[PDB]
Amino acid sequence: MLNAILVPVGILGVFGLIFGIGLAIAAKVFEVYEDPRVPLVRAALPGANCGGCGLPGCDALAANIVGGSAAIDACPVGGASCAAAVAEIMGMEAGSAVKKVATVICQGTCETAPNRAEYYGEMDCREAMIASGGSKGCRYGCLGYGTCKAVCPFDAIVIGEDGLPKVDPEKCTSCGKCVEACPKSIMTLVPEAQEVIVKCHNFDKGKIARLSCTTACIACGACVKACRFDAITVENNCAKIDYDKCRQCYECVDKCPMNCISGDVEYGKSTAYIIEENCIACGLCAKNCPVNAITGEIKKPPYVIDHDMCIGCGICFDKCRKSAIEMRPNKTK
Amino acid sequence: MNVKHGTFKGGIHPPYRKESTAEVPLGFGKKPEMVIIPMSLHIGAPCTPIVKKGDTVFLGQRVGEPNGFVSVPVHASVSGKVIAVEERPHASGDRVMSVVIESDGLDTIDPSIKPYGTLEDMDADAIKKMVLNAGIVGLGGATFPTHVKLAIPPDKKVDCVVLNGAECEPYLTADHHLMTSQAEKVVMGLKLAMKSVGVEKGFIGVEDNKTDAIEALVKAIGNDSRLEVYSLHTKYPQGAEKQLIAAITGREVPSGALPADAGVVVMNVGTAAQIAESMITGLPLYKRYLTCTGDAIKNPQTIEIRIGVPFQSVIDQCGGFSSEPGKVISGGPMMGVTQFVTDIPVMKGTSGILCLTKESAKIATPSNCIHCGKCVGVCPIHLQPLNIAEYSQRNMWDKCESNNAMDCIECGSCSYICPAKRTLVSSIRVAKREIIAQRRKGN
Amino acid sequence: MNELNLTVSSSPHIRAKHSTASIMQNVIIALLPALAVAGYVFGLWALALVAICVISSVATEAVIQKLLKKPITVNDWSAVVTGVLLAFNLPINAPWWIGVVGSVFAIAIVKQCFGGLGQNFINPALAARAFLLASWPGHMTSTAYIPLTDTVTTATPLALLKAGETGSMPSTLDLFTGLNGVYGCIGEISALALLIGGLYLIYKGIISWRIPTIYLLTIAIFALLVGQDPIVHMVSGGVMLGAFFMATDYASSPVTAKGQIIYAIGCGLITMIIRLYGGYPEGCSYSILLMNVATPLIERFTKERIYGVTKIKKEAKA
Amino acid sequence: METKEKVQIDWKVVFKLGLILFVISAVAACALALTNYVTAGTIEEMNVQTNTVARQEVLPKAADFEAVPAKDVEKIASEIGMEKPEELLEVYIGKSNGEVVGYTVKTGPTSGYAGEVQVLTGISADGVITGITIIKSNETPGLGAKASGVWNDQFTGKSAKEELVVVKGTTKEGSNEIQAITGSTITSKAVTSGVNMSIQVYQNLSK
Amino acid sequence: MTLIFIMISAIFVNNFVLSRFLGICPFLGVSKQVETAVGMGVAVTFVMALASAITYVVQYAILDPLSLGYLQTIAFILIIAALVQLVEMIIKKSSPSLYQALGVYLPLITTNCAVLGVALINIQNEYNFIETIFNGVGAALGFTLAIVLFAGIRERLETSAVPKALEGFPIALLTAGLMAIAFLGFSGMKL
Amino acid sequence: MNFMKNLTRGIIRENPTFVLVLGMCPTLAVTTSAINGMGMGLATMLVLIGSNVAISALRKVIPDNIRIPAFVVVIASFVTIVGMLMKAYVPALDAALGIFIPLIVVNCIILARAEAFAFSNGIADSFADAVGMGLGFTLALTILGSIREILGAGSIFGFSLFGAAYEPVLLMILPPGAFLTLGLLIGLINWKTKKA
Ligand SMILES: NC(=O)c1ccc[n+]([C@@H]2O[C@H](COP(=O)([O-])OP(=O)(O)OC[C@H]3O[C@@H](n4cnc5c(N)ncnc54)[C@H](O)[C@@H]3O)[C@@H](O)[C@H]2O)c1
Ligand SMILES: Cc1cc2nc3c(=O)[nH]c(=O)nc-3n(C[C@H](O)[C@H](O)[C@H](O)COP(=O)(O)O)c2cc1C
Ligand SMILES: Cc1cc2nc3c(=O)[nH]c(=O)nc-3n(C[C@H](O)[C@H](O)[C@H](O)CO)c2cc1C
Ligand code: SF4
Ligand code: SF4
Ligand code: SF4
Ligand code: SF4
Ligand code: SF4
Ligand code: SF4
Ligand code: SF4
Ligand code: SF4
Ligand code: SF4
Ligand code: SF4
Ligand code: FES
């Protein structure tokens, strides 16, 4: 009766032993020679498989990296957290990458910028670019046929009723596909904190641009004169705002002849709102303050200051050694 | 004369409407009052104007110097006073730098213009210099400079020069009248080009439907055995460069290469005629045989016109519009570029002014592909457009490149023969542009 | 200035006269004589079944294309062609619900689920026959039942050939014209009408001679090699309609010459093999479906040499 | 050489892989042997009981069935005229009250559509087929699975002196004629074939 | 003639994917491209041939004399899976190239029904050794042919405008159903 | 919190027949009726529970080089146990099943979930995942079998529905019927998920 149990145990044990010995003697010969750098980076990447960063797929970064050909923030979909994770795996500091959103720099509707010749063909922006360079009255304006919407994989672009595309700030990962896929080179990336943008991609002179569209940049030069910090420049008869030096004083939007800059009059006006606790009545603010909206006598706490008008500025977080001045948006609406 | 027949594989037979203008005798045009001379009259780099407001020029005066090797000077067509230098509408739809100028009224010629001599006095370097100085470009549509083509590289061997007298497009009968009336100038230009290149074989490609042109060319050749004339089967796109070279010489131009690799130098008949005219008289290129036709024109005809005359003036010269046009085309139906306004000056490379009415411009909306396999059966490059178009519409540029989308000549046969009224050549052009842009961005 | 409202396009600005609607109308015009002979031999019920199939196909396509928010494209006459070719496959004793179910399956699953017209990969009218034959064999087995004497047919001529009972076969000429004592599907009584329709289609340029000519040639060659009568094998069965109107399908046949030649050779070989040695009395549907399955391989392996490339010898990627 | 002798003392991975696999396989084999000892006899007992109740259903007139020796099972199979029989499985003789009442034969089929089907045929002593039953059929459902049920009633009460023939029709024109199942004709010609071997065996046994 | 009949029945008449419901998960998972389909076919062919040989030589020599028909499946697994592991090892280093980890489908060659099913059928049908190898090779070639044809059809359907709801796996299932409908014509062939 | 989350993930969100696309041979081969689908679902659920529990309990002794032989040996032992038990108890289900009862070892779901989740997780989490995924597989098989039986036999669980004169769609229980039904069902599920 015993042998009926010893026979299958012995047979299966012999088979398992010889097969395991063969597999182990083959495994050491069949050596892959891999490094522990690809397996620990697969859950850090979002794995969206969206080509706007370089190599196809999202499994290509964990075949690269050991060559230094790409930066830590090469993947914009993951963002600051993924960049910091990759940097701390590689052992270096992670930069403070500001989140960016795709934005159209053309505000032209079918009523504002009418066409001059009806178009026949496929409903696409590149196909319209082929047919004698677009059917729009403005040569550089947005066609509105929806190529940027069909390329974006996160469904963050909705074609509006006026023909221009609107980008939802919550669903945009700044992958950069729509920027490359727009034939008119209109789609750009703007920081989320930036509101004052020059929304006209027109390179023509004054009269032609004014005839083509009702909100066209004519390179008059009033916005440059209004700007104090030197952040907006007129090149190729078009205005462009440098987002690094722009402190959002909301003065270029006021002095534009035809509201070419996307902004509203609600800004600043805080003539040195000073916390009473952390200033020693130093009296370094009433001296000039160029427009002279601070003047007082030494200003022992609490500060006796009349608030009537200001410049906005937004730079007085460095003039105070104790940081007593607070900036708050306090205007109409 | 041993007249030989040649043809190629593939193509279409569109309904050539060469009856309303072919039998009508060629006329001339009146002296224009004002002309717009653009600075972009060629495929190369644009020129830089030197005349300012208030100046006075004559015929043949230099207006813009070349900028680079592949660039050509631009001459004033008519003597007069320049009134403005500004951006003006262009045949490509954009606005380009240009000089507008009203004419004096008596057409005074430049005293510095002199004849260049004869055929035996003119050597290859001087021929190239005269071609560059005369402002002669490719009159076949591409507007490529001729002096670049005539300057062959030392690493490439060429043995024959081929004249392209085969107008494969409908409605265009300019070259027919040119070889009918000025065959001797065509022969002289062919001889000059053959002497400039340094070869001994010359061929002429003429379709068999123009027997009068064949007889005129045979009479003009004489007893010269070094030049031959070929009667080709009436087909489209038989007039193309690769198809003509395959039909005449039998060689095939390699993919992504030039006819210099095949040992051939091909020029339009009009270019040779202009070269001979400039050698005889010394005047630059400022006139062209332009045909105005279509079902929206009262009296379609072929006329000699200057360079810089707007479309409206020549259209008014041809009797004006009979009805309201639905399409104005600067060229043939299969290769022309549609227009927005009729205030655009004529080019050096414009071949025809075609006016389609509203009834003839109505094309049905594109529909689903039925996989009939007629686009593949008419390709002269033996491609399969039903795959390239579908890959281009789905944003797959890698498969477009893998399906040889860069070998297309944009002849329009595939989109002509398609029963579903699809647009196959525009998607292929999209794929070509995106592949070239990706190559530029990657480097 | 005057507002000249023009039109803008790339190329070409002139187009051909033909279109999809013209192609399908000419196909139906070519199919009409077979319908006439079917109405003559059987009666009004053949025309009623054809009308039922046409109405079912048109309604199914219209409803499905409207429910998907797509533009309605019942004007290209593809659904009518599919319905007619499906009604030509049915017996005279098939009830109406068989035709309705077949039309719904052909339009919905085979055609509309893959994208629409010309975007499928298999033959719809033969897929709707390969589904009704396997689902309801009792109704799809007894094809045609009434001669003028009502009881002197028993079996149909193609099954008698496989059973070896050649003593009751038609004398190889009545079976051609289709007048007395021949009984098959609705549109297979006469082969002369189908031949006339195929000749008209060849003349109009809609179909190419390669597939029908090579199909009939290889069937004749195989039937002569084995030892059977080739004429009886081409004329009898659904060889004529399958070769002319169904093997020459647009969305399921190769687009090149070599592809069409190989496709026709394979269709004929598989048809003859299934007929002589298989379990079915005929094998046109299954051979055509098998060669529609293997069509992309033939398309991939038989591409024409592009102008310029001189056969690079597989050494530019190593 | 040999990857530094399998990284010197690291031959233990080669040893322990095989040892672990051996232990796991031995444990699994011991469990399987124990459960086989637990439930081996129940399977064959259930099979015998199923065959017994199937035999009881076919022949109700028999008090008990006696098994003929298998040497005889080959002996009649050898000479009564089948090319490669290989299917005359078992023959049982019914017995009731001192007299033989009939026979039961588990023969068949020859060649089915999708394999082989085992049909049990019971023939009474006076020469009347009392019924048939299918006990093993790997046929496609809906077509070949319909052969067990009402159709079997076509084989009851018929004489046992001539072979049966299958006909495609809805009219019973002959005594030895069997109507085929609609849509499944290959299966209907295999069960009747098994009945043909059964009646041949009964005819040999009656002599 | 008999071996040719076995090969024909294994490839065409009784194709494993399209007529026996064996080996469908990799038939639907890796058939997106022709090249990966061919690689899968070659790997499955080698695995199936070696498995058929080894389980035949172990079934009629070891298990049958000792009356151990209840362990059979387990034993076959220890013959199949280990070999597949070696195959997974071959695809990476032995040949210095070919560099393809298929992804959640190379370990499933052990789990493939067409690999163990052909081994079980090959003893259920009582075939000889040469017949065993021939039937295994025929089943492998049938699997390769089916997966190659399916990959070609899917690469064709890559250009068709299939609806967004049916993109991916439902269209693959519909295509497989239509392929089975087409392949139904070989049923009942008695050569 | 993770136990119910894993169970719900196995039941609805994973659903190996409808989303994961695994275990398709017994899905399309035995779902000609609801009873056979229920039996396959229960057997697969029991085998999956046993194999996942054993593998997650033996995660510290199995190296990465011989993982497949040990995994499929444990799975095959459990499958043989279950098959012999159902041979002893339920002969009708085994007779209706046939070749696919030894082929439970080659169900892709079992080894996929062994190598994906059961190897690198605890006993309780793996047990919850096995319970949820077995319930999901059972529900999918029951739904598919009910639809196929309704269309091709006119009955549910053996009780006839469309009277007695109904002529069945005989291709419904054929392999093409199963393929088409699964394709249409997955398409409907995808459409409902995307539109919600
Ligand atoms: N009005 C008319 O008569 C008319 C008729 C038909 C076509 N066209 C249009 O004319 C345009 C010509 O297109 P294309 O495809 O023939 O050629 P292309 O436009 O590519 O260039 C023309 C000439 O340049 C060559 N070329 C370019 N770079 C060169 C170099 N470095 N050296 C030597 N040669 C070089 C070309 O092969 C040829 O000699 C087409 O767009 C066509 O559709 C006009
Ligand atoms: C589709 C197509 C059709 C063409 N047809 C003509 C034609 O009919 N006549 C012609 O002279 N050039 C034609 N060309 C241009 C030739 O390819 C070539 O570039 C030109 O003839 C050279 O002009 P040249 O002689 O001034 O160098 C065509 C080009 C294309 C792409
Ligand atoms: C020559 C020709 C043959 C056709 N043959 C068939 C056919 O059998 N069955 C079919 O339904 N449709 C046929 N059609 C219509 C055809 O549906 C359509 O082009 C696509 O097949 C859709 O599958 C045919 C069309 C043409 C022009
Ligand atoms: S952009 Fe980021 S998520 Fe997208 S593929 Fe690149 S690395 Fe992956
Ligand atoms: S809107 Fe542009 S940048 Fe933002 S996700 Fe879409 S494609 Fe990427
Ligand atoms: S932004 Fe660019 S891509 Fe988007 S609709 Fe406008 S033109 Fe087209
Ligand atoms: S003028 Fe400026 S705002 Fe108007 S359409 Fe053109 S780019 Fe847009
Ligand atoms: S103020 Fe407005 S119009 Fe003037 S240059 Fe600035 S952006 Fe252009
Ligand atoms: S918001 Fe102020 S700082 Fe920014 S560009 Fe306008 S004027 Fe300059
Ligand atoms: S610390 Fe700030 S608030 Fe105080 S005196 Fe200096 S500048 Fe003024
Ligand atoms: S930022 Fe400086 S200059 Fe501007 S209001 Fe404040 S204190 Fe005055
Ligand atoms: S694909 Fe290009 S070469 Fe071929 S027919 Fe179309 S335009 Fe002509
Ligand atoms: S000609 Fe048009 S409809 Fe025919 S296959 Fe080509 S693209 Fe499709
Ligand atoms: S192949 Fe996946 S369960 Fe059979």
Numbering used by the authors:
A (entry chain B): 1 to 333
B (entry chain C): 1 to 443
C (entry chain D): 1 to 318
D (entry chain G): 1 to 207
E (entry chain A): 1 to 191
F (entry chain E): 1 to 196
Per the authors:
The Rnf complex is the primary respiratory enzyme of several anaerobic prokaryotes that transfers electrons from ferredoxin to NAD+ and pumps ions (Na+ or H+) across a membrane, powering ATP synthesis. The complex comprises six subunits, with three integral membrane subunits RnfA/D/E, two membrane-anchored proteins RnfB and RnfG, and an attached cytoplasmic protein, RnfC. On the cytoplasmic side, the complex comprises RnfC and RnfB that are responsible for the interactions with the soluble electron carriers, whilst the periplasmic side harbours the flavoprotein RnfG. We show that the reduction of the unique membrane-embedded [2Fe2S] cluster electrostatically attracts Na+, and in turn, triggers an inward/outward transition with alternating membrane access driving the Na+ pump and the reduction of NAD+.
We obtained two structural snapshots of the Rnf complex that represent states along the reverse and direct electron transfer directions during catalytic turnover conditions: (1) an NADH-reduced state resolved at 3.3 Å resolution, and (2) a Fd-reduced state at 2.8 Å resolution, with the Fd purified from Clostridium pasteurianum and reduced by catalytic amounts of a CO dehydrogenase obtained from A. woodii. Since all determined structures have overall the same organisation and cofactor content, we focused our description on the Rnf complex with the bound NADH. The NADH-binding RnfC subunit is the only subunit that is not membrane-bound. RnfC has a globular flavin-binding domain and a small helical C-terminal domain that binds two [4Fe4S] clusters (C1 and C2), with similarities to the FMN site of respiratory Complex I (Nqo1) and HydABC (HydB). In the determined structure, we observed a well-resolved density for a bound NADH molecule, which forms stacking interactions to the non-covalently bound FMN cofactor. In addition, unstructured N- and C-terminal loops of RnfD bind to the cavities within RnfC that stabilise the subunit and could be partially resolved in our cryo-EM data. In RnfC, all cofactors are linearly arranged to the polytopic membrane protein RnfD and located at distances that could enable an efficient electron transfer across the complex. In simulations initiated from the NADH-reduced structure, the RnfA/E dimer samples an extracellular/periplasmic open (outward-facing) conformation.
